[PDB]
Amino acid sequence: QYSPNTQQGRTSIVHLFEWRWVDIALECERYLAPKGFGGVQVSPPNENVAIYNPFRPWWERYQPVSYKLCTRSGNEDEFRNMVTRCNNVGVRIYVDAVINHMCGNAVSAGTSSTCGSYFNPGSRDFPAVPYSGWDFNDGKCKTGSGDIENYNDATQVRDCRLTGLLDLALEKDYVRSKIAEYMNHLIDIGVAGFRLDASKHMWPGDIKAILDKLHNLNSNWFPAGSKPFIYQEVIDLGGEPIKSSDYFGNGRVTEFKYGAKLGTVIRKWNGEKMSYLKNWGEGWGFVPSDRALVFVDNHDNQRGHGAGGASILTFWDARLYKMAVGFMLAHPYGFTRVMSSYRWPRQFQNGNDVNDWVGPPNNNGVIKEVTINPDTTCGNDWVCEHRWRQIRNMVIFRNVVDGQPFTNWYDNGSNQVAFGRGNRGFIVFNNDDWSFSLTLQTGLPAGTYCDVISGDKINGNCTGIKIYVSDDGKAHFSISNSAEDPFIAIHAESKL
Ligand SMILES: *[C@@H]1O[C@@](F)(CO)[C@@H](O[C@H]2O[C@H](CO)[C@@H](O)[C@H](O)[C@H]2O)[C@H](O)[C@H]1O
Ligand SMILES: OC[C@]1(F)O[C@H](F)[C@H](O)[C@@H](O)[C@@H]1O
Ligand SMILES: OC[C@]1(F)O[C@H](F)[C@H](O)[C@@H](O)[C@@H]1O
């Protein structure tokens, strides 16, 4: 459960949020494989409710109608084509599994679904699965509203409806089997693992029972006995009865404290400073590294829809965002997930974005293809953060230093810090309101290294900043607080 199942040397996965299967397949071959990306988290591939009010919101995909591989991202044929092509290039696919619930209980009955399947939330009828009233927790939930009302009561959080979403009776073998049937279908197709959506709303024991029915990965691409990578979406910040540790027996868990705290630190909120990141990781109360799935932002909290709050950094905060992602990718703690999003008309009113529901770039509801600009950036309103030189090069940095220890830490007692990874890499950050000019011990072999943030190493030459490491491993670093990117990163493969 705990191993990502990525190719040796590939240490990160990217969330291609709302991307079409055909576009992902191409991205795997043209960019992800050549650039060393480990895998891709795809949006829910199962049929969901088609919501027109608002117009096709991104969250409609988290309201299942059936387990048919039929969505705005493509059909089963397109999905299989993508998994196959990506796997053939050594890039894994991880499915966002929405198994805790079906659609909202108040959703109108009919065929307003991505595959035309009929469903009736009111009567608990989902014939395409099939599911009936006997498969939901209507009788198990003890709240007066039938929905989750108090998170201080661990029982209702699992047996009641999350904001009205019909809650599946996961204790029933029939329900467990139907979900396993869906997941096994995906595994046999070639997926390497899953993100278990709303895991906090599922009993650890129920998840385990379901995972116990899962197949080993497809033996045509993976070694015998390979188990699907499992990372459970559990939002666990401050004081709550439910702890993400309650799910360690099933696989990894999303560490939402990671992005929340990193955001507050880089934003320098309430006295926080980068010098405090010296003991980053378990020292900050985070889950063990081998059970952590980390990220700066996710599809939910990048639009104030999830845990983290206003401290979460996103592509909207480009400069600080690159620094946060850079620190994450350089630091050894956990398995890293990079976010890839689309632009939307953010409309802030009284502190809240009233357009936080807007779905992916589209034409009359049809998701737009991802176009690639001559400079390798994306068009059609796709942000493609994973294609940003500063982020892509850090994804590679993590690969190059894989296994190397956290060492040679330095800090000015404020927001100027630096550290290395064994003798394979070194990174320096300046988040202070003044320039940083100092000679530091890099632990790297003597030579000339290309800074992979400001530039690239191309045919024996650096396109950006150049760093010179002496025989004693020391090197001079100069970063103005006015620099486009106030951080420098160099590694074994950026050496001339
Ligand atoms: C997991 O599935 C969710 F449904 C619940 O965590 C997603 O939540 C989004 O969709 C819901 C149904 O449309 C909305 O009610 C909810 O406000 C919205 O955040 C969640 O994003 C997924 O990670
Ligand atoms: O994750 C599941 C669990 F909480 O911890 C361990 F996995 C146990 O084996 C299992 O029976 C229990 O329900
Ligand atoms: O341990 C059993 C379980 F996983 O967690 C709780 F005990 C629930 O009451 C039960 O229905 C569920 O199957």
Ligand SMILES: [Ca+2]
């Ligand atoms: Ca539940």
Ligand SMILES: [Cl-]
């Ligand atoms: Cl997540």
